[PDB]
Design a protein around this nucleic acid. Structure first.
Ligand SMILES: [Mg+2]
Ligand SMILES: [Mg+2]
Lengths: 68, 55, 171, 104, 144, 189, 145, 75, 143
RNA sequence: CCGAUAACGAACGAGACUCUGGCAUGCUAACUAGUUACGCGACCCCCGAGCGGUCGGCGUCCCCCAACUUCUUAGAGGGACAAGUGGCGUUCAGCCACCCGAGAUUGAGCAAUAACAGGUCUGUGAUGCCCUUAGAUGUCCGGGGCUGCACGCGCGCUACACUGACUGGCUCAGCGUGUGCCUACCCUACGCCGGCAGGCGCGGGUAACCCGUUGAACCCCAUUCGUGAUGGGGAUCGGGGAUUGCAAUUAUUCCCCAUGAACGAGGAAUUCCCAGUAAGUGCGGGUCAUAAGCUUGCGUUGAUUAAGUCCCUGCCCUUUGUACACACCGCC
């Protein structure tokens, strides 16, 4: 248990998906690489958390719209 | 009194020989690494010395 | 080797010298807004820099006070003659120096200003010099047996984790 | 010459120690001196565990103060002299050098 | 017939005990610290030492010469480091010098018997805390 | 083929009760040369189900303080006891152990919190993993109590405990404790 | 050889002034005498040259008296000076080993000399308190109540 | 159950019992023979190794903390 | 099929070498071997009368395994647990004089010699003695 | 956090963070770490093995006289994200399992608004007021005391035994310290004397250079003991011998020989704990001239049970009542 995400990663995931939907895709490693230059994330441990939530949200987006 | 008994006590060792290099206290002395600093004066000056709490 | 002391004791002793020098300079130059001491040590000579708010005060008439301090720090620490140099440097953005603002607050309260006035002036000066936030506490007894603590905050202020060490200046 | 120098760098902060070693190797390589790789001595951890309280009353909490000392070795072995080629050391506060000849 | 440079060197560790198996071309012979696999103490767990050869077969080992040096931990940790180094040494040797069909058809046997022959144990220890004798046990407290 | 302790083949041992078939681990997949492995069997729930039962026995036989980590000593004790029961009964020690576990595991129990009449209020039927746990615990405690203040060694006391439990003869500590516990559940049904 | 009990086997002996059980081993059997313990018993048996594996009950009279005289005269039987009880006596200065009710009476003599000279240890023994300077605050209450 | 007072040396009535029925049952250990014939146990080990050397009993284990013997096969 | 000492059970090897030293009688044995204890933490003297031969074999084997060992190294090897009565246990060394007398007997047997540095190592005579004893005990183990 | 939604957008704390552990046969490297290969030896070999085996034997930065970083060290980069699959879920937040994987919850440190007349004036050249200040409550010196014992309590250590004790042999660590401003006091190798405690010379080490390949204990393998307050236990006490110190008595500590007390698993009650964990088991630091049954760390061996609940004990949130608000230690 204890894998619930935080506002700090969720806000960033929504924002970068909105800004760079065209650049980004549904591959985790591709997303964790594009984030490295589209955002100055101080921490790798937070960067890949953001990337994981980004992949989850984009997999959702391919099916149906969300609040973002 | 006079010269031959005022400081005549053998003080080459023990608690009484060593003292705090800061506040001249004889309790809680930290002699590791040649600190010669009090248990409390060390907590005061550890940041200046260079000791950092990591874990 | 035999004459030299081990590296561990050497670094501990160097830190000891830093602490004692800082405390002596604090007590001596407290009324001149002494911010801190930075010591550059080379194997040949020792260079020390007194970061202060008022260089014109820390160095006396014709530099009398600074050369007097140089003699003092020679005598205490056994430095050979002409092997240590004392410089005085003005602190940049003194409003961001926790020690300097605490010293000015002490000077105001010693003068006898109301703590609310003095603390709010310090808050305004810090925020005017530009900071994410600041926080002052005055605790103790004034005119009464029962002691009170008064706290004045503004802006952001982080407390926990590693970032506090190099984000928050404390005094 | 024939001379071989061992320079030891000792400090507390790895960032400045790595800088003051790397610029030494980088400077000497341009001057074409045979520089053996910077040997990393095992770091020395001075650990002091002290009661947090200044009185004695409490829940017996302890502070684990740690002081880490990092040490690097750099060997310059040129066929010709070395002292005349290297007269600057480019130090920053905190790091301490110690010159040594290979005889020692 | 005399092809040199045919040797690998593989380590295996468990609880601060590291063993280095030097797998080299030659006749079948396994020695740890200059001694054969038998007579290594404790004599209990000798089957644990022998389990690599017992499962995969003596014939496969007949083409290699194994010398293991181990300098850590305690007795059982030495045993586990030795067996892990032995089991990983020849599978790496096979991966490097023959086809990986052989490597997979040996490593599947090893992995279905016990995963620890090829995968090190990731657990080491836990620090002691200042409220009790061990890592988690706390000193007995009294109320009256 | 596996040759636990170099002998005592595993493929001839059957678990006759389906209720315990998938928790006893003497089959060929769980068969092992020695009753010793740092397998992290307490990593999560039900991980001990796939743990070999001889390993579980040698892990439960190290108890009562003076010997908590002495797995090598417990392994040699299990070795000697298995050899003794093989030469004493004439069948596989593994089959003896499996039947002992089956007969030792108390099929029921009782548990509440309210004002108990005799021992405990509500009868209940236990889980198979609880069957294995309590059977191993009862057998180990019986052997330990038998070999406390007599000349008879741990290996011999464990041996006769398993031998008596495998058939049911009212003198085994595990069987007696199971009988008492089943009786109190029956009375407090 | 572990054959049957010898005819001249005594279940209990009587050496010096106190009986010893011969059913146990000889070395651990003569330790029942006051003044002689495991180390002294083993060393006197080494000097007496008797089979250590044999029981005390099957010892014969000449071997028993040989062991007796060995343990009674250690100074003349190579036994080192640092192995005896009463080394360098506070009374006569002769190194000796005491192995009888002589031990009890030497103990009361050494207690009563301190009591007579009013030494602190003598006073403590007279009062029944601890004598080696340990704390009596929370221990030794069993001997009092 | 007060005391055992087991014998420390053999006699005529027990030595013949040891020679007649000890090599007749499968499990023979020093503890078993001690509690069976009221012998101490040092005698048990010594006499069992004597019968082992004489050949009427076969050793199987030979371990320090526990040594196990057996009767000879029949037929 | 040569045999080195490291190819056989050391526990039986040291016993066989002790028997060899006992049968070939020239090793010097101090007159107090029947009296002293082997170590400070030992409550009794060793049961075996030829503990000197056993210890001589053991120290020869250890010197074969690693050289440069002195009295301080030998006493560390043979040290063990001290129970200290009601105090909790600690670790204690052996008997310095016992180890030194044994090593002096070994060099009187002329199979142990002083090193170029401190400590002692094995002569080729001792090497050949040890390895031939190893070969014979290996043959005995085989058959 | 998601959702509901007169709220929307945030901030502190949580998280994030730093350190530590787990993986990189990938990078940079190393005579203060080494490893392979090779050369001299030393031995078993001779049946002959001969690119045979062992060597912490000596060497190949003795710098011209091999390479390499796998093992070791320490830097930068990577790697793990509920990422992949199935199931459950508003199909959201997430949860369960499995695969690949070194790892699918490694431990700590830091830590809010505040409150506790909580503890410390015996930490301080932190400090108000009071007290004393020459027959001193200053300071020094001598001795004693802090240990003192009908008794009660707390943290503990050792045991009650054969799953053991003794004797011998075999065999494995990691933290970490080490010669001093004052300051007198370091870790110890090697050889010799003694049985031990110890003593005497001769070095090395200011340290990955020496102790040290830390030959630790438990454990493992053999001997004896044999259910007996017994070869378990070593409490109490006698005698002797050493060490430190100016000084050992009220025994500092250590060693040796003697007596051998309760104790045969412990009432009512009660403590701690979920994986390298409990527990067994030793080794360092601090204290230290001498001192560990303490504490702080480290390593070795290594489990049983549980993946839940509010029954007990507490704490928190919401509703509620209030004559309390110095707030129930209230008011009256
Ligand atoms: Mg945090
Ligand atoms: Mg005594």
């Amino acid at each position: 248990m204890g894998r619930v995400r935080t506002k700090t990663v969720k806000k960033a995931a929504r924002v970068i998906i909105e800004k760079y939907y065209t650049r980004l895709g549904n591959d985790f490693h591709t997303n964790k690489r594009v984030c490295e230059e589209i955002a100055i994330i101080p921490s790798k441990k937070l960067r890949n958390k953001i990337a994981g939530y980004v992949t989850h949200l984009m997999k959702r987006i391919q099916r149906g719209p969300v609040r973002g | 009194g006079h010269q031959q008994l005022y400081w005549s006590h053998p003080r080459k060792f023990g608690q009484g020989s060593r003292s705090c290099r800061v506040c001249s206290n004889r309790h809680g002395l930290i002699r590791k690494y040649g600190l010669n600093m009090c248990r409390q004066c060390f907590r005061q000056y550890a940041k200046d010395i260079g000791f950092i709490k990591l874990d | 080797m035999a004459v030299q002391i081990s590296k561990k004791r050497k670094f501990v002793a160097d830190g000891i010298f830093k602490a004692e020098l800082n405390e002596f300079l604090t007590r001596e130059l407290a009324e001149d807004g002494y911010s801190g001491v930075e010591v550059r040590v080379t194997p040949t000579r020792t260079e020390i820099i007194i970061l202060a708010t008022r260089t014109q005060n820390v160095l006396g008439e014709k530099g009398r006070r600074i050369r007097e301090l140089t003699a003092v720090v020679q005598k205490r620490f056994g430095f050979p003659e002409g092997s240590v140099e004392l410089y005085a440097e003005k602190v940049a953005t003194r409003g961001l120096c926790a020690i300097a603002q605490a010293e000015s607050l002490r000077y105001k309260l010693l003068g006898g200003l109301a703590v609310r006035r003095a603390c709010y002036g310090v808050l305004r000066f810090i925020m005017e010099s530009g900071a994410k936030g600041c926080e002052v506490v005055v605790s103790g007894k004034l005119r009464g047996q029962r002691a009170k603590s008064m706290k004045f905050v503004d802006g952001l202020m982080i407390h926990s984790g590693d970032p506090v060490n190099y984000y928050v200046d404390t005094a | 010459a024939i001379h071989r120098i061992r320079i030891t760098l000792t400090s507390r902060n790895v960032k400045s120690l790595e800088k003051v070693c790397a610029d030494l190797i980088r400077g000497a390589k341009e001057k074409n001196l045979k520089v053996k790789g910077p040997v990393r001595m095992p770091t020395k951890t001075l650990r002091i565990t002290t009661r947090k309280t200044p009185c004695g009353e409490g829940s017996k909490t302890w502070d684990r103060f740690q002081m880490r000392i990092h040490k690097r070795l750099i060997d310059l072995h040129s066929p010709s002299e070395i002292v005349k080629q290297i007269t600057s050391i480019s130090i920053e506060p905190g790091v301490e050098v110690e010159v040594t000849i290979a005889d020692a | 017939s005399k092809g040199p440079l045919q040797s690998v060197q593989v380590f295996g560790r468990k609880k601060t005990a590291t063993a280095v198996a030097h797998c080299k071309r030659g006749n079948g012979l396994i020695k740890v610290n200059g001694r054969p696999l038998e007579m290594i103490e404790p004599r209990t767990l000798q089957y644990k030492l022998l389990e690599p050869v017992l499962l995969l077969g003596k014939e496969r080992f007949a083409g290699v010469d194994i010398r293991v040096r181990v300098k850590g931990g305690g007795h059982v940790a030495q045993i586990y480091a030795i067996r892990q180094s032995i089991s990983k040494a020849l599978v790496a040797y096979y991966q490097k010098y023959v086809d990986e069909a052989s490597k997979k058809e040996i490593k599947d046997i090893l992995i279905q018997y016990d995963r620890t022959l090829l995968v090190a144990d990731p657990r080491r220890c836990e620090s002691k805390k200042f409220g009790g004798p061990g890592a988690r046990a706390r000193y007995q407290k009294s109320y009256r | 083929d596996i040759k636990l302790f170099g002998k005592w083949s595993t493929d001839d041992v059957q678990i006759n009760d389906i209720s315990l078939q998938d928790y006893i681990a003497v089959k060929e997949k769980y068969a092992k040369y020695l009753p010793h492995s740092a397998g992290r069997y307490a990593a999560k729930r039900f991980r001990k189900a796939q743990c070999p039962i001889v390993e579980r026995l040698t892990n439960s036989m190290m108890m009562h303080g003076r010997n908590n980590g002495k797995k090598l000593m417990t392994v040699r004790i299990v070795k000697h006891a298995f050899e003794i029961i093989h030469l004493l009964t004439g069948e596989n020690p593994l089959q003896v152990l499996v039947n002992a576990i089956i007969n030792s595991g108390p099929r029921e129990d009782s548990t509440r919190i309210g004002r108990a009449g005799t021992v405990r209020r509500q009868a209940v039927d236990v889980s198979p993993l609880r069957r294995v746990n309590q059977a191993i615990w009862l057998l180990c405690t019986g052997a330990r109590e038998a070999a406390f203040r007599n000349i008879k060694t741990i290996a011999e006391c464990l041996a006769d405990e398993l031998i008596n439990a495998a058939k049911g003869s009212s003198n085994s500590y595990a069987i007696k404790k199971k009988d008492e516990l089943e009786r109190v559940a029956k009375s407090n049904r | 050889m572990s054959l049957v009990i010898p005819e001249k086997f005594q279940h209990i002996l009587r050496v010096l002034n106190t009986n010893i059980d011969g059913r146990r081993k000889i070395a651990f059997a003569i330790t029942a005498i006051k003044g002689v313990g495991r180390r002294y018993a083993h060393v006197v048996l080494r000097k007496a040259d008797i089979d250590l594996t044999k029981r005390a009950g099957e010892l014969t009279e000449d071997e028993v008296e040989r062991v007796i005289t060995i343990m009674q005269n250690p100074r003349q039987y190579k036994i080192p000076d640092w192995f005896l009880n009463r080394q360098k006596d506070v009374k006569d200065g002769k190194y000796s080993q005491v192995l009888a009710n002589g031990l009890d009476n030497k103990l009361r003599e050494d207690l009563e000399r301190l009591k007579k000279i009013r030494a602190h240890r003598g006073l403590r023994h007279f009062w029944g308190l601890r004598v080696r300077g340990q704390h009596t605050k929370t221990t030794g209450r069993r001997g009092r109540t | 159950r007060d005391k055992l007072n087991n014998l420390v040396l053999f006699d005529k009535a027990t030595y013949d019992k040891l020679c007649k029925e000890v090599p007749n049952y499968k499990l023979i250990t020093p503890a078993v023979v001690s509690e069976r014939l009221k012998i101490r146990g040092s005698l048990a080990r010594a006499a069992l190794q004597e019968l082992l050397s004489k050949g009427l009993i076969k050793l199987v284990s030979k371990h320090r903390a526990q040594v196990i013997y057996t009767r000879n096969t029949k037929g | 099929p040569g045999v080195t000492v490291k190819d056989v059970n050391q526990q039986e090897f040291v016993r066989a070498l002790a028997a060899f030293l006992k049968k070939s009688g020239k090793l010097k044995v101090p007159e107090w071997v029947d009296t002293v204890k082997l170590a400070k933490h030992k409550e009794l003297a060793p049961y075996d009368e030829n503990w000197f031969y056993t210890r001589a074999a053991s120290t020869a084997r250890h010197l074969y395994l690693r050289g440069g060992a002195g009295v301080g190294s030998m006493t560390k090897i043979y040290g063990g647990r001290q129970r200290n009565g009601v105090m909790p246990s600690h670790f204690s060394r052996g008997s310095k004089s016992v180890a030194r007398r044994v090593l002096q007997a070994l060099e009187g047997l002329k199979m142990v010699e002083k090193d170029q540095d401190g400590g002692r190592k094995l002569t080729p005579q001792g090497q050949r003695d040890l390895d031939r004893i190893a070969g014979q005990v290996a043959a005995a183990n085989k058959k």
